[PDB]
Design a protein around this ligand. Structure first.
Ligand SMILES: *[C@@H]1O[C@H](CO)[C@@H](O[C@H]2O[C@H](C)[C@@H](N[C@H]3C=C(CO)[C@@H](O)[C@H](O)[C@H]3O)[C@H](O)[C@H]2O)[C@H](O)[C@H]1O
Length: 499
């Protein structure tokens, strides 16, 4: 990939303003892309776009391939008379996922029945054609979701054995009995990918590239794990014997026990890494580049015994990252991947990243707690093949972070900024001071969360890791991101050779 010198904004589509309880792939999404282009921005970064479960996290999806039905704009379906929409009373500035769950799933199901009643033959055949095209993952995903309604929302590895173990007759009978439910889930997928495609075409017409994201590890309770248990370290009952995480750190005392199933990489290699090829293909249908979270896991991963309640016990296990990425380069002709390389990284990880020319990340909130700090701009690679952020979706807003930062951090930050000619008078100005610093740097891409453009405090934090609740909920208000915000971003980009 060739990275131009430019800037972008980080905004998950759920955070878009608009009616009916969550950001969707419609007019407000187009309005945001127009805002971004007029601000001089060339990149729009989102988080993973798959269907979510308990905790609402984009990084723990029911499928590695599916799209999130919550992002479906219902207004076009209402225009065709498929459904009547009535706002139940959604809050301002945040997603209420309980109310969204209770109101949007039934609205989608009503819209599906309306479509079955009133759709033209053309629409019906286009929907059937989509199903045929995507069957290699969609048949499993749709049946997986349908079976949740037959089994009280249980995960797949708690279903009756004939279904859990995917016996041929059990599946055939399930598919016939749940034909309507299967079709409904296929329908949500058809709509998602249709609406995303339209939005991607609009971005492309405006000169904007979309940066997507995926977790290296998939979710325990997902259609692909169910369909391919041999690829994972599961016991005979389909439960993980070991799980993903990271060991104790400078930051974390016990580390993080993520709980994801771990790949049997030997099995994936023997199978030709088809899972990874398909995942990247699917990513590249939606995005122009894709970040992979926990990129270091391609070189080695921390294996936690499933019986351990923390991440303290375990061992590092090597993974065939070099072989995988050689195959990717060979078969795609390029590797349009961004490496999430935060936390503790080794020379082996850096070499893998650099062998394939993958841009890494830099986070300015991490730069001020100790002049050799790699997150300080003067320490960035001479080539500048990195993406600089003030913070990611995992960090507090920059104003939130500043308000809780240590005395030594605050003092060093102020002096370092002054060394770059940047000064500020009030704490609410710190987000823009740090955005300016990132734009002055050699980093090819500077990408900022929209909360920092707005200089919002901790209430607008997208995710607080560890905390299982309150996350992924921040939304823009209508008109909050103003033309003056866009003019300020454009001025900064023009001032730093990013336009
Ligand atoms: C990179 O990937 C991270 C790991 O998935 C992601 O973390 C967010 O999303 C997770 C799904 C969420 N919960 C898991 C973490 C645990 C402890 O660390 C377990 O207790 C839970 O059972 C897991 O489901 C994380 O808390 C959340 O931070 C990052 O957002 C992403 O950038």
């Amino acid at each position: 990939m060739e990275l131009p010198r430019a800037f972008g904004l980080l905004l998950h589509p759920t955070s878009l303003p608009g009616p009916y309880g969550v950001g969707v792939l419609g007019q407000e999404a187009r309005d945001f892309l127009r805002f971004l282009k007029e601000a001089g921005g060339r990149y729009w970064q989102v988080l993973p776009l798959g269907p979510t479960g308990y905790g609402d996290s984009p990084y723990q999806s029911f499928s590695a391939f599916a799209g999130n039905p919550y992002l479906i704009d219902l207004r076009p379906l209402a225009e065709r008379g498929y459904v009547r929409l009535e706002d139940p009373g959604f809050p301002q500035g945040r997603v209420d996922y309980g109310l969204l769950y209770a109101w949007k799933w039934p609205a989608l199901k009503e819209a599906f029945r309306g479509f079955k009643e009133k759709a033209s033959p053309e629409e019906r055949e286009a929907f059937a054609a989509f199903r045929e095209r995507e069957a290699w993952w969609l048949e499993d995903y749709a049946l997986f979701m349908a079976l949740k309604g037959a089994h009280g929302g249980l995960p797949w590895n708690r279903w009756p054995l004939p279904l859990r173990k995917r016996e041929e007759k059990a599946l055939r009978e399930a598919k016939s009995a749940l034909a309507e439910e299967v079709a409904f889930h296929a329908f949500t997928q058809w709509l998602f990918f249709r609406q995303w495609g339209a939005l991607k075409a609009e971005a492309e017409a405006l000169g904007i590239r979309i940066i997507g994201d995926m977790p290296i590890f998939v979710a325990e309770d997902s259609a692909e794990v169910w369909a391919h248990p041999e690829w994972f370290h599961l016991d005979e009952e389909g439960r993980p014997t070991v799980v993903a995480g990271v060991p104790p750190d400078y930051f974390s005392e016990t580390g993080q026990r993520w709980g994801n199933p771990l790949y049997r990489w030997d099995v994936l290699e023997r199978e030709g890494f088809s899972f990874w090829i398909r995942r990247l293909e699917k990513a590249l249908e939606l995005f122009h580049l894709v970040r992979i979270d926990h990129f270091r896991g391609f070189e080695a991963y921390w294996e936690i015994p499933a019986s351990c309640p923390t991440a303290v016990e375990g061992r590092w296990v090597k993974a065939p990252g070099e072989k995988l990425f050689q195959k990717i380069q060979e078969v795609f002709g390029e590797v349009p991947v961004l490496a999430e390389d935060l936390g503790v990284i080794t020379p082996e990880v850096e070499a893998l990243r650099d062998r394939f020319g993958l841009p890494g990340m830099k986070v300015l909130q991490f730069a001020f707690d100790x002049m050799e700090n790699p997150f300080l701009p003067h320490n960035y690679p001479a080539h500048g093949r990195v993406v600089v952020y003030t913070g990611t979706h995992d960090n507090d807003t920059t104003l939130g972070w500043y308000r809780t930062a240590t005395p030594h951090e605050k003092a060093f930050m102020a002096r370092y900024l002054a060394d770059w000619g940047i000064t500020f008078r009030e704490e609410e100005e710190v987000p823009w001071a740090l955005m300016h610093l990132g734009m002055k740097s050699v980093a090819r891409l500077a990408v900022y969360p929209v909360q920092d453009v707005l200089a919002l405090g901790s209430e607008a934090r997208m995710n607080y890791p560890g905390r299982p609740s309150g996350n992924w909920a921040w939304r823009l208000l209508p008109g909050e991101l103003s033309p003056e915000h866009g003019a300020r971003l454009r001025a900064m980009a023009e001032a730093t050779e990013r336009l």
